Design a binder for this molecule. Structure first.
Ligand SMILES: Nc1ncnc2c1ncn2[C@@H]1O[C@H](COP(=O)(O)OP(=O)(O)OP(=O)(O)O)[C@@H](O)[C@H]1O
Ligand SMILES: Nc1ncnc2c1ncn2[C@@H]1O[C@H](COP(=O)(O)OP(=O)(O)OP(=O)(O)O)[C@@H](O)[C@H]1O
Ligand SMILES: [Mg+2]
Ligand SMILES: [Mg+2]
Lengths: 331, 191, 191, 353
């Protein structure tokens, strides 16, 4: 187990994720404790501490998987990313709940040594919400308790850190109900029309009660002493991400034009406007794709029509939707 | 008799009077002589709408021949104190307090129907008693006259010397004349 | 007493008064002397029907002996402002204010019963005060009289000189006489 | 073979479709850049080649299915039209979510690699839409359940589709076929979305200075999807995370006057010509006067049923004639006029003698 200090964990992870450093701080120390504490408890006085499971709650395209991947990028121990929809009744109607342990057998390399420190992670856990449904939750909760169960190869379930993260739909509305409203007076603080519209109501402050109200099994809801809070996005972080990945959207756009032999010249100024379009559609980092894909459609239907189109210059007017691609066609 | 109206919301059907249904859309009605009881209703309506949505604008329709100065001031002071912009639409007559409340609306949100009539005159008062009491009340009615003229100048932009000159006697102004004067911003003719 | 009525819609049974039940069918009633309070209700109803269906045709029955000029202008200006056509069907009598609203209806949608009576008269106003005040008020009523004549001339199509002449004294007109005059379009006799 | 430009592909689509240039170019551009991905497999930091799955939407009779029909006959890669209604969650008895992949294999000779290159279109996507914006208490397995089940494939996964034989074996070496290479185009008529966007765009208030709008009308269908945004999709019932998976959103204007006057004859397969071809076998000619065409065009509009309505109009007019010609021989031709279409007149019958 890597087990670095919280400082190292956050700093080494920041390299690949921008904007999620707030939640990182919490998760950093969280996982740090779990490995260290359990591995070398040394029969601590009045041992009560339960597995330091951390919850993950963020909307779609919030970088849940990215934070899960970066967390598992340097972690030598296995991570065995799994799903909650794939799970069904225990080999009655479909897939059994032992498939999560089966994904661990692949990552652990059939090594009990690796199995015991397996960081079982799940994604989109919010699709089993009670309304199979609640049955999968209970059959899932059984393993969360740390009940040794083979898939066949015996697997150590004790000390398995759970960083499961779901894109809970309707989470803010439930925590919005808990929030109080303003009064009606001349010396009263009406704070807003609504309360979960300025900041993410869900990922600022959460208590186990709020999760139970959502419609989840109370035992599982009160099974994780720690929690997290993912920030949807940031305006500053949206311009950096535009060209941060190895095959970033803008990069790939130019690479696609380069296949024909055209350069995709782009202006810094245009970038700012682009961020606003994504912030308005409110579809996450992935959302930005649609904005430029449509904008480039004209350029993806002009460059082919005219050959020998050396490059294409995009200005702030083009992202505003008034200007037409400035073809730089020449000799 | 006040007719009943059905909203037929998604949750279920509800029955509201004609006035309550419009109140849901941030609309307040000022009808009849201005007095403490009816004025208190407007104040309560303004505060309630503020809590529902302190950002959405409010529309105050004014059809009154005037009334109590104190009651009117409670409405005017409330309109400016709250955050939402209280629009104003004259629907035919504003003699003394109707124009103060029509000209005390947010900039760019003061309207008037095509055939509306707006007037402005100095506040009328009545009191009897000893000479000392008369002198005290005379100063009070003179102080109010100045504060009212200052309010019109602020919202209309005209100098105080012109307001005082125009309020000495009854002055009738049509929709077009009021726009140039500064009492209103636009004259609504058609949708 | 106002009798109650049940709609018996698909959703279920809801009880509406005789007046509110007809309001759902784009019908508004104007009965009695015209005043700010009753006129304001008509305005509220007209606006409500507009939002419900801005394309349907509204119907306004008028049986009134007249009233406040300012109150009538609020209704007339409202009818012309909104997009839906406001049909008129005079029942009983229609005095000066009632006739203006009747003439103000959408072209081709003005009706009257066979035994209906329509009278057009000049504005009746009263005021007391000094000579200066009388001179100011006299100009105002004379201005309103000119605007009302222009309104009738526009809808009826008759020249302004004829309107002022016929409005000097009380002139009663039957259904057939009104059609030739231009106040209405068709006289409903039977279904 | 030579990675046809967007213009080189739209040319064939224009042969039949009349006016769907927005969608035709969207597919042309997508198809164009898609082909490059197959050839751009070099590990030169140009491997990601992410795909923005399109979600074709619009009123009925807007040539939505038609596009796939014509595109299926042009694409050099195996193209398979699909439906989101029949395939259901494997757990519950019924067809399995993976069977559609097998359909591609059937037309691809089970060459998984070649299959991967192919595309996957899914018409009728408005059906799977969640019962309500918020899930109901009763699981909608024939709905959002399938939506999530397919979602992972859209993101990218592998499918263990079986081979053509080998039943004896317990799992018969289930063929592994990639999904990230198989582009996805979601088609569908979003009936009711117009009201959603209508309120989302502006909620008619009350007052002189309000934004009062028609309570309920089917007159705004025309270009009713040019302001649709992911939020409105969610309201319709398309699960938010599912919406994000498909960034591109196409729009299909209801119809135009020129397209209706042109579609009767202009397209390769023209309703008029279809009856004329049948009439030829009978031994008669179908002369459609130019005014006749404009008449039918107008008639189609009232039905508000899409281009399909056109067929009904002609069939109604050409009912007595088609019932008489066989029994009434000696008919050289049947001239048509605008009055005939209107119904005031009866189709002019011609006789050589
Ligand atoms: N925090 C982030 N930093 C940089 N890029 C991000 C971030 N979050 C999302 N992205 C972008 O989103 C794309 C991948 O989206 P992904 O499939 O990870 O969504 P997701 O966050 O896993 O959805 P969910 O939260 O529902 O699991 C990548 O192109 C990536 O650039
Ligand atoms: N733009 C068009 N040009 C030519 N023909 C059309 C056009 N639109 C529709 N059609 C005709 O309509 C039929 C195809 O209907 P279409 O694919 O438009 O329905 P759809 O929108 O797919 O319906 P649904 O959304 O319910 O699947 C074909 O017979 C075709 O001739
Ligand atoms: Mg992801
Ligand atoms: Mg179809």
């Amino acid at each position: 187990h890597k087990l670095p200090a919280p400082k190292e964990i956050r700093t080494i992870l920041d390299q690949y994720v921008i904007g999620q450093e707030r939640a990182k701080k919490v998760l950093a120390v969280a996982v740090y404790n779990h490995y260290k504490r359990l591995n070398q408890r040394d029969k601590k006085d009045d041992i009560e501490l339960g597995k330091s499971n951390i919850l993950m709650i963020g909307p779609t395209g919030s970088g849940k998987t990215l934070l899960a991947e970066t967390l598992a990028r340097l972690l030598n121990v296995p991570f065995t990313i799994a799903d909650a929809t794939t799970l069904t009744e225990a080999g009655y109607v479909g897939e059994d709940v032992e498939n999560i342990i089966q994904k661990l057998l692949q990552k652990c390399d059939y090594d009990v040594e690796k199995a015991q420190m397996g960081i079982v992670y799940i994604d989109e856990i919010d699709k089993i919400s009670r309304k199979s449904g609640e049955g999968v939750q209970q059959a899932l909760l059984k393993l969360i308790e740390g009940t040794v169960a083979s898939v066949f190869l015996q697997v150590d379930t004790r000390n398995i850190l759970f960083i499961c993260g779901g894109a809970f739909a309707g989470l803010e509305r439930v925590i919005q109900n808990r929030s109080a409203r303003g009064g009606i007076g001349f010396n009263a603080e009406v704070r807003s029309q609504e309360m979960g519209k300025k900041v993410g109501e869900a990922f600022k402050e959460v208590e186990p009660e709020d999760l139970v109200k959502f419609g989840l099994i109370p035992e599982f809801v009160g099974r994780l002493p720690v929690i997290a809070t993912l920030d949807e996005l940031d305006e500053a972080a949206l311009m950096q991400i535009l060209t941060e990945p190895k095959n970033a959207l803008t990069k790939q756009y130019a690479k696609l034009f380069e296949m024909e032999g055209v350069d995709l010249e782009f202006r810094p100024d245009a970038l700012k406007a682009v961020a606003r379009k994504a912030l308005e559609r409110k579809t996450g980092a992935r959302g930005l794709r649609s904005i430029l894909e449509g904008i480039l459609l004209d350029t993806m239907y002009e460059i082919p029509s005219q050959q020998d189109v050396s490059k294409v210059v995009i200005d702030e007017s083009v992202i505003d939707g008034s200007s037409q691609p400035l073809m730089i066609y020449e000799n | 008799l006040v007719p009943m109206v059905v909203e037929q919301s998604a949750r279920g059907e509800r029955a509201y009077d004609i006035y309550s249904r419009l109140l849901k859309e941030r609309i307040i009605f000022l009808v009849g002589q201005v007095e403490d009881y009816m004025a208190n209703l407007v104040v309560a309506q303004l505060l309630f709408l503020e809590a529902e949505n302190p950002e959405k604008d409010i529309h105050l329709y004014i059809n009154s021949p005037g009334g109590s100065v104190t009651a009117g001031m409670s409405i005017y002071d409330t309109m400016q104190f709250i955050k939402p912009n209280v629009s104003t639409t004259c629907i035919g007559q504003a003699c003394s307090m109707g124009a103060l409340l029509l000209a005390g609306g947010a900039a760019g949100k003061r309207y008037c129907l095509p055939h509306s009539r707006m007037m402005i005159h100095q506040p009328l008062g009545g009191f009897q008693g000893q000479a000392s009491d008369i002198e005290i009340h005379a100063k009070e009615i003179l102080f109010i006259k100045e504060r009212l003229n200052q309010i019109l100048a602020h919202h209309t932009g005209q100098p105080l010397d012109v307001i005082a000159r125009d309020t000495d006697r009854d002055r009738f102004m049509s929709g077009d004349e009021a726009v140039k004067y500064g009492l209103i911003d636009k004259v609504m003719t058609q949708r």
